[PDB]
């Protein structure tokens with residue numbers, strides 16, 4: 001029926017056309033240490049975010065999932081300000097990026113319990129004093145493995161999902177562990193229809209994807225526009241991969257996004273022109289402007305795309 | 319002549335009796351993600367900190383070095399409030415606890431430069447907008463090695479020390495790398511008389527210490543009261559070790575402290591009773607009330623102790 005957004009509960013029927021994975025703000029853990037050179041300018045950042053939101057509304061986006069983790073600068077009140085200004089629905093996450101705070105607590109024996117308690121509080125009571133609840137649980141695993149640290153979060157996540165029916169969204173590292181993540185969450189009682197395995201576009205072998213899809217989870221091709229960095233494949237390889245699965249009838253299990261960071265937290269930087277040109281398409285219109293057109297030209301039907309941006313999010317949250 | 323404190327520049331002659339290593343606030347990196355259950359209560363925390371400061375003043379402490387790293391909740395304005403209330407001098411640090419924020423920047427090729435630039439700005443311009451400058455650079459290495467990540471900070475630190483004459487204070491992990499740290503900083507032009515190698519009390523082999531002292535650096539026995547946790551020796555083993563070096567004439571190179579955390583950031587916790595009893599003496603009076611008395615009884619002279627708490631800090635900062 002309902003999903004919690006940064007502006008409170010909203011009917012799932014009303015979510016409409018949705019990007020499953022975008023960041024208004026994001027910083028890599030440790031950004032907070034770099035405050036003297038990386039101080040947060042709220043009014044300018046709000047301007048950039050409101051601009052990004054409007055752009056999305058231009059292409060009929062009514063809802064955005066912003067899964068920024070707790071230790072990556074998640075800022076619910078700021079997201080609420082963006083939503084209040086634009087009418088955009090924004091759903092935020094509870095979760096951590098892929099030690100030693102939770103490692104210390106593991107020494108105390110309470111760590112996995114504390115993580116569960118955190119998920120429950122943020123899903124059912126509210127984030128800090130913002131009075132905002134998260135709508136998704138955010139998980140991430142490492143390249144080629146789900147570490148013992150990460151598994152605590154996975155187990156906590158599963159446990160929390162059973163109580164709340166919250167959606168789980170995942171991050172996979174460099175195209176690994178898709179099936180392992182799905183299998184492990186299912187072992188601990190999670191519901192596949194409530195799970196999105198993210199960053200699947202980081203692997204070009206459609207066999208890998210089918211292995212993941214066999215579990216009945218959603219997968220996200222959510223890194224469109226990211227090329228030539230962090231061992232990423234090109235958008236063409238993504239399209240090629242995506243086409244294979246669409247033709248094989250998997251549309252009810254696939255969702256698309258860019259994983260943009262519209263305001264970087266911490267110290268400003270400039271990608272060097274080696275990297276810069278390859279990333280030039282990493283913005284929130286790129287799906288609408290460049291990717292979807294190519295898909296049409298390869299005979300993907302509007303009924304199919306609507307399953308991805310409208311039907312799938314709707315089913316996911318219902 | 320002068321050292322920067324949280325209340326601005328102060329003549330070194332006026333620093334007086336000094337604890338080289340205590341924390342008013344501290345949290346392990348990642349504490350900020352646990353905001354919903356670990357929210358910071360400023361007025362209560364300020365009360366506890368002011369209490370801790372008064373305790374120290376009772377035993378003639380005029381100056382405290384608080385080397386809380388940037389990503390561990392370092393809060394200069396808060397420290398300034400404690401100092402303004404108590405007349406205590408508090409010197410704070412610039413530095414990081416022992417990825418991926420600075421790992422990402424290493425991908426950009428600017429990381430070590432950015433770190434240096436951060437040290438320079440915080441030593442010579444100010445921390446954020448607080449108008450407070452750090453008085454020490456804070457470094458830490460891992461158990462049994464100084465990683466390539468950590469070396470960036472070491473090289474940045476050395477470089478900064480040459481420009482500013484700032485003091486470097488270090489953390490060693492479980493009694494390793496003392497001599498390596500000293501040797502590496504010296505290779506890059508750091509001045510041994512401006513370096514304190516911390517957590518030396520984590521190793522009980524006085525040969526290890528002498529190896530470190532041969533470089534002409536200060537060493538800190540700064541974990542008094544910490545027992546039965548993370549490879550910590552007992553205070554008795556510390557005393558035994560300390561006595562060997564005092565009798566061998568190293569007093570001009572040794573300093574003492576407790577490495578207290580008076581307000582933990584993040585989620586409150588309680589130590590289990592197995593751990594809790596061993597740690598019962600971990601407070602800022604313990605040196606004064608239990609350790610120094612034992613040293614007197616083993617015939618350590620007041621002239622010697624004064625070299626440690628007064629002469630050494632004074633020489634260190636001058």
Ligand SMILES: CCCC(=O)N[C@H]1CCOC1=O
Nearest residue numbers: 023026226229230259260261
């Ligand atoms: C420039 C490299 C790509 C990148 O940083 N993507 C961001 C999006 C949010 O989480 C990520 O790591």
Ligand SMILES: CCCC(=O)N[C@H]1CCOC1=O
Nearest residue numbers: 341344544547548577578579
């Ligand atoms: C309870 C274990 C001991 C402990 O927490 N020491 C703290 C002091 C400050 O930096 C440390 O890591």
Ligand SMILES: [Fe+3]
Nearest residue numbers: 021023067259
């Ligand atoms: Fe992301």
Ligand SMILES: [Fe+3]
Nearest residue numbers: 339341385577
């Ligand atoms: Fe410390």
Ligand SMILES: [O-]
Nearest residue numbers: 023171199259
């Ligand atoms: O991401």
Ligand SMILES: [O-]
Nearest residue numbers: 341489517577
């Ligand atoms: O410490």
Ligand SMILES: [Zn+2]
Nearest residue numbers: 171172198199
């Ligand atoms: Zn991700």
Ligand SMILES: [Zn+2]
Nearest residue numbers: 488489490517
């Ligand atoms: Zn330390």
